Amino acid sequence: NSSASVATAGIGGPPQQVDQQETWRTNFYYNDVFTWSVADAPGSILYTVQHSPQNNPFTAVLSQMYAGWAGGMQFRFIVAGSGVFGGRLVAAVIPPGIEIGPGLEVRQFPHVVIDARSLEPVTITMPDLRPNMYHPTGDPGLVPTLVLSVYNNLINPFGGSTNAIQVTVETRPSDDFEFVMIRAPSSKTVDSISPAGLITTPVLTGVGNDNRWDGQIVGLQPVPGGFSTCNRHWNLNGSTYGWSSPRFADIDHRRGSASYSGNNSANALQFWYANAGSAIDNPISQVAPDGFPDMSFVPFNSPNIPTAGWVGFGGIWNSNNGAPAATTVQAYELGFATGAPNNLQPTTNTSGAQTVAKSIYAVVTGTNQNPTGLFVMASGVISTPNASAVTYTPQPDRIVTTPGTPAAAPVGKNTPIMFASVVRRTGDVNAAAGSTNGTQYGTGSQPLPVTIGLSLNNYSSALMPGQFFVWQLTFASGFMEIGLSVDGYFYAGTGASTTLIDLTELIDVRPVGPRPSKSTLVFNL
Amino acid sequence: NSSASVATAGIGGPPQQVDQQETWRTNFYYNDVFTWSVADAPGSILYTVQHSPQNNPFTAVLSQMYAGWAGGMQFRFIVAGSGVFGGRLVAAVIPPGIEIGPGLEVRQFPHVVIDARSLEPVTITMPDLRPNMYHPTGDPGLVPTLVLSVYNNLINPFGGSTNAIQVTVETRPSDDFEFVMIRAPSSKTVDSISPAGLITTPVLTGVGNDNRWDGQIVGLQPVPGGFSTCNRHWNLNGSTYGWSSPRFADIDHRRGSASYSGNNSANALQFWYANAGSAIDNPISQVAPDGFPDMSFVPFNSPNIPTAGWVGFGGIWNSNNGAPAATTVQAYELGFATGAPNNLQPTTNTSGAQTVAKSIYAVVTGTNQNPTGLFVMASGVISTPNASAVTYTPQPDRIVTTPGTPAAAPVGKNTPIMFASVVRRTGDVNAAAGSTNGTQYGTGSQPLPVTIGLSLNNYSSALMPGQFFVWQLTFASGFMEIGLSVDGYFYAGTGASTTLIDLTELIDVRPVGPRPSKSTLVFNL
Amino acid sequence: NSSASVATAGIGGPPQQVDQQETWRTNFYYNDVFTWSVADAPGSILYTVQHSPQNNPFTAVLSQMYAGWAGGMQFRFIVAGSGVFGGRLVAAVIPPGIEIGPGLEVRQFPHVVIDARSLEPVTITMPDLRPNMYHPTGDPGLVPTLVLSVYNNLINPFGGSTNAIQVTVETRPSDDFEFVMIRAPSSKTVDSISPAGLITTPVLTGVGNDNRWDGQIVGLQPVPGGFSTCNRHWNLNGSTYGWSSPRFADIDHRRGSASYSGNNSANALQFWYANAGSAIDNPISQVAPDGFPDMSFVPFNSPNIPTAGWVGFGGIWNSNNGAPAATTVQAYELGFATGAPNNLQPTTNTSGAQTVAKSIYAVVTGTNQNPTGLFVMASGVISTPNASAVTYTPQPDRIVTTPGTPAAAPVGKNTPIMFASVVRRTGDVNAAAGSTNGTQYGTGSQPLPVTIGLSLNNYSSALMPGQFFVWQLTFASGFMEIGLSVDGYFYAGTGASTTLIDLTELIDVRPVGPRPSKSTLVFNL
């Protein structure tokens, strides 16, 4: 690999200003560590990095201080384990012009080998292979990448009882490394925007809540079979495929049709429905009124209760009138459906759907009119039998989504998870119940604070489509990793387990950074 | 001019560190030739080319092996003369970022004159005008342009038809030219050039098919009125505006209404329809289902057959059970229409339309159902009564388009072309034609391996919106040029022509690389 | 051994007159790796390769540019060890014309030992054994072989499952290696290697389709009983024994007899047949018409449907007039049979057979005519009653073959494979299945771009009848090898397996070049 690049790092002028500083470059300090197991395949990539000053601790804080950089940086690797262990690793410096993934053939680029038995550390100096121009802390332009790959797999002769060893990574800047465009310290560009700050501990401990139910988040729920979600959900492209803005507020739809069933004008069950694409007061999407639940309706016939329906309180409002008609005000079961008045069927897709309401108990005096509005409150309560507390609501089938929505499915051994929260439940009027309030797990895709920050800031040039942004969770007994995708869905490396993970013994959350999607999030509980 | 700069290029070049290949390249190799006539006016530009590793053919093969390039290229010019013809051309090396087109004069540039009376070739070195920045082979950036323009008019002493001579160009890399970043010439796909591979000899010869009727390409059809195409179309930005898959696939639509009109349940024409924009089971877009024809319907009255209709074979398919109805199996006209079920009228706008199907002959027993599905085969036949019929189908007026689709209209003397194929026609019981095939012409806007390849790999930033990518088609006798826009339309230089070009006597196809879109593409057949 | 011959090669080499490329090739590049276990017996041959410009990847790219080659190649071997395992391998440079296979011993050859306890790589030069005759790049002739065989058995001190280690090979061209006859690296097609291009990553990924049902390839199916295929099949000799075109094309047969059996002219099953070997309007061979299925008929009785029948949609077409009959339009079973019109029995021999068609449902009015034509579409559907049905179709017993067609039967542990795809099934009015696709498996013997490419360019004398051309298929987790015989069958190394291999998690495909056919192809998935 090149070495004349240093003369080119060498060129200065008006970026230097006064009084440049070598800073500390002398010794090697801990950047990172990686694990190598007998499990891992030849041609698998254990460690990768683009050349940057964010590869020492000292040059990452100086990055705020300086606006531009140039030159080489040295990477030192220490294999720890034993001299009795077979296997070999390959470290190679790759020039820019590349897309890294399944076709990027590490063992056919100029490279050096690292042997597992090495007692002493092995060093590489990584130069600049495009040294002609200063990089800012904006776009650097395309830079060389350092990749370490397994050439032949780790062997223990004493069997499978011990099966992994670690390799340390240490760095120091080289001689040719320099900085420029100092200015004075402040915050700047792409550096200040990262998905990291969305998730944090106080939100999961007790400050945060879900985006479907406004509940307190008690758990993490794995969903092996996948799911799809859009309403009040957001991505790292800054937009939503939903019809709700990211806050809880009343459901107002001005044009629907209203009727009642029982052939009696007083003491009857109220019905309201409308087709999708008439939400004239909603800017987000005219498909349904903001605040309307993303679930398919649940059939009930009087006096029988809906088994795990969404219920909210409200009543019927005509457009000419300043406030709703009181006689109509009652609890309603709400959902998305097709086939109103009396051929009702649930719908999982918004295209050709109908937004439907029916009162769970009798209204004082009904109303027959068309068109006329529906006015129902911000968050809902769960309708379900008396002492019911089985699994969670909605199940993946129950969630309604648009045809623009991308679905959440497993990637590798990484499984999508939903955030589980405590919801109010009711067993139908009076009687008895399993407890004082009863147990009930309502689930959402996201914590509402993450949803507000995806809507607030655009993170497209801040997490790549192949990556997850990763944080690690610490529990009193055990720890795990959790990931957020660019499509807004959250993942865990739990595989096919369904067990509820308890956030109530949560000590901590902290970022691990960007990781590629296929590679498994840690689960040790 | 800039021939001192040999030593100042030699600071920008050397950080890379690589060998010089001199011994192979003693001789110059053929690049192109152009024609010079008595009617080519002074100020006109006959020939232009950008600096690129693709100018010498052997350097193009070597470009594959390397990820960067730099240094100059020599150009050598031969005038074919006579010695009795007067006139001159001017050769200038144009700076980077100076727009090329007919507005461009050589007037105030450094230049050499190329003389009509010359008998000796005249050799210019084209130096590197970017040398501080090494160029990538697969993302190069901005380069200079070599331009040749007519200073003085070609004049002949005598009469006759004889009015033209040719000027040949051959090239050789200079002693400053260099390849660097060998790495692994291992597993990159588009090292080979992405745009250039779209058209090839055996593909235009007999391997290729067209992307709308699946026929064999016999010819090229100019459309001097211009035209528009959205479906099964891709482009050099990777984007599309269609609904149908990149390959040909069968029609399955689960959600329609079926009915018939008449005085009886039997020996009637079956009708089925569903709305446009409702196909939520199509991954590409909801405009219609996959396999659905992008040409407007043909109204007809029982018992008569539609002409220049798209007909396909299929039947009514039960949505609840998932299974066909045999009695319904018949040939059907499938099309886009508006005014369903019974006020039907034709449109070319998808929005607010209905995708409609009607049988071309009597079904034994019809069915009235809602909902019911439609299941029809992939392949399509043109409906035409006995012998002599319509010139080519679809005509540009028949084609439907969806918002976002740009239309292709002539530029200068370049006119947009469609690809013509021989297609199967059926129409009217025991009909016949004047020929055995019954010579019926189906047209597509692209060849299908091109539609598939432009959907499989990226092509962005390779061709400039002012330029066309050019290939030269070579016949046993004569040649012509064909061009590709950024948009993914093909163009040819026949001007106000409607005449069909016969591709039967094709020997070869070669890439000519980008050329300005106002440059006429030559026609000598 | 033969390392004196440096100066005697230098008379045979020099008449050509060319430069030496040294500066690019400082380092060695990855060629392959193989596995060494406690169960690989002494005398066994683990790895073999012929001298060829295709061993180093960058030399392969350069081979394109040149029409001849000569000189040696260095080979470098790394044992992955541990230091507690005993055993040895022997490395010999084998003379030209000495047959390779398991009968081959290293016993009396010059050799080096490669040691289990080795920690340092061991490097052999493979000299040119042909130097008086310069080799062609695109017709090379006879070369020597490098062979590695087990001298002493791998032994472990301890128990556990741990029983294997790997040995890597990397190569570098020698200082004697040379390229000559640059000419024009211009316009030769198969400069690139003809055999190697047949299988590619995006082709096995999602661009390829199979050559009998036109479906998407999901898997590989081993057939440990062996099988035979003639139609739409080509080979590495360019020869075929089929009737149908290299692409999928519609059935048109002008000369048949049509009849029905029953008690009435209406609501009957139409039957049509013509003899095999009579299709004089088919350019390829008169065995049947173009588009006709190469699987034996399925007898059925009215009113029941055939199972695992080939069904296609079409009708009776008037031979005198050249035009269809609408009333006859229906779904038909098309097949090869013997015993027509009414003693019909199935066969797999074409000679003395009849190509037969029978409708699967009632036609409104039937026709009795002689002669009358048959006109049916290209695409085909599998006939199956409701849900659970046959494992794959065609089964090897159903396939018809014509004289001259060789059958593919296992060799050693390599077994012949068919390519599996998901195909459309229809059968029995308003039927259904357990899944929405109704998971029906269609099989082809080759991928269709391979059938088309093996018909488009020549391939003779590239692969030796004892060897198989090998490609390596690489997955996200594990890898396997696939092989191609001279005959144009594909093979895999699953032995007595019938289990279907799922190609869903494929990352990559790379050519491994020829290997002896008795060599097992590896399976680690």
Numbering used by the authors:
A (entry chain B), B (entry chain C), C (entry chain C): 45 to 569
Please quote the authors directly.
The etiological agent of RHD is rabbit hemorrhagic disease virus (RHDV), which has a single-stranded, positive-sense, polyadenylated RNA genome of ∼7.5 kb.
In addition, the resolution achieved in the RHDV inner shell (radii between ∼130 and 150 Å) reached 5.5 Å (FSC0.5) compared to 7.0 Å (FSC0.5) for structural features at larger radii (between ∼150 and 220 Å). Comparison of the three quasi-equivalent monomers (A, B and C) in the two models showed that the relative positions of the P and S domains correspond closely to each other, but that nevertheless two significant differences are found. First, the NTA domain in the previous model extends to interact with the S domain in an adjacent subunit, whereas the current model shows instead that the NTA domain folds back onto its cognate S domain.
